[PDB]
Amino acid sequence: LVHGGPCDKTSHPYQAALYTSGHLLCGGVLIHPLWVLTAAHCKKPNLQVFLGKHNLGQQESSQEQSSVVRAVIHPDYDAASHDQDIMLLRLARPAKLSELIQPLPLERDCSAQTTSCHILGWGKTADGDFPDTIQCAYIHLVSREECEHAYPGQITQNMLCAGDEKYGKDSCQGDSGGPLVCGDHLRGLVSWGDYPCGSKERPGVYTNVCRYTNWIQKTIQAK
Ligand SMILES: N=C(N)c1ccc([C@@H]2Cc3ccccc3B(O)O2)cc1OCc1cccnc1
Numbered sequence: 001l002v003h004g005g006p007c008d009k010t011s012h013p014y015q016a017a018l019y020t021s022g023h024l025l026c027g028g029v030l031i032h033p034l035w036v037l038t039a040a041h042c043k044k045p046n047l048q049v050f051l052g053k054h055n056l057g058q059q060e061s062s063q064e065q066s067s068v069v070r071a072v073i074h075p076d077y078d079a080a081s082h083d084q085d086i087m088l089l090r091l092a093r094p095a096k097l098s099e100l101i102q103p104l105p106l107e108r109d110c111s112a113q114t115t116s117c118h119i120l121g122w123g124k125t126a127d128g129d130f131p132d133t134i135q136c137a138y139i140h141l142v143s144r145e146e147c148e149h150a151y152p153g154q155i156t157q158n159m160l161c162a163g164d165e166k167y168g169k170d171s172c173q174g175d176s177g178g179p180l181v182c183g184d185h186l187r188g189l190v191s192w193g194d195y196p197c198g199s200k201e202r203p204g205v206y207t208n209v210c211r212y213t214n215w216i217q218k219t220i221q222a223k
Contacts, residue, residue: 001119002126002198003169004137009054012120012134014104014186017053018177020044024056024130027121027178029186030103032220033094038177039189039207040077040087047071049091052101056122057132062100066091072219074212083156085191085207087177088219107185110210114183115141117162119190119204123174124197130174137169141182142203150194150202158211160188163203171204172197180206 016028016036021044028038028049036049052062070090077084095101120136139162147161155161162180163170171178171190180188188206197204 001121001123001135001137001170001175002172003167004125004135007054007120007134007136010099011136012054013052013098013100013102014179015053015120015134017050017056017122018042019048019050020046024122024174026174026176027123027190028089029179029189030095030101031106031186031216032103033097034091035220036089036091037186037189037216038087038089039085039191040073041079041082041085041191042177043071043073043087047089049089051095052098054134055132062098064096064101066093066095068092074215081154081156082192082205084158086189086212088216104179104181104186105184106213106216107182107187107210108213110208112182112185112187112210117141117180117182117187119162119171119175119178119180121171121175121178121190123176123178124172126198137164139164139169139204141187147203147205151205155205158208159191160206160208161203162188162206165200168198168200170198
């Protein structure tokens, strides 16, 4: 996350860190004791999910670790266009809930009024390095018309755009799969955007979580 700052230790109990080959790959959101929601482009070998983390450089008494027993990619995910960029990860055992590990409720209403949002993650900061401490930034939802101009012909109804035209606050490499939180609900997932991150003209693109209510519930309830 670029042009942000450190989060407080108690504000992100739903945040997950996704590892592959010993390095941070993606963020994710705990949405149920057995399930983490992330971006479909985060599907990499032998994913390790970490819950209750704040500082990736230290061993924390609040942290829990799990391998993935089932990675469920949306059946209509299109890798070239990042359309329907959503994946459900079933954990090895139910997450042990605490003050620092809690699920985040999904925004089910696609007509939700709140445009005031926040993003978080351990992706690249303004200096180009990967932070040990999780970063936070307040950003806002950008109109469909504004985002369409930024990314001509690349925005579908399964995408939302959010950013900051004033200071360039934006998610970056390592943050994808991470949450876009508006009114204490999950509004989106970090999906893609421009390179370098933090343009004042091109906001970040997020998976529109409200479009996936039925699919998420049907996957979680599956036999
Ligand atoms: N600016 C954004 N909103 C943005 C946010 C997250 C990510 C990535 C996308 C990604 C791809 C593959 C595996 C993981 C990720 B992820 O964690 O963040 C990329 C982003 O912009 C494109 C980009 C690609 C490459 C370098 N810099 C920037």
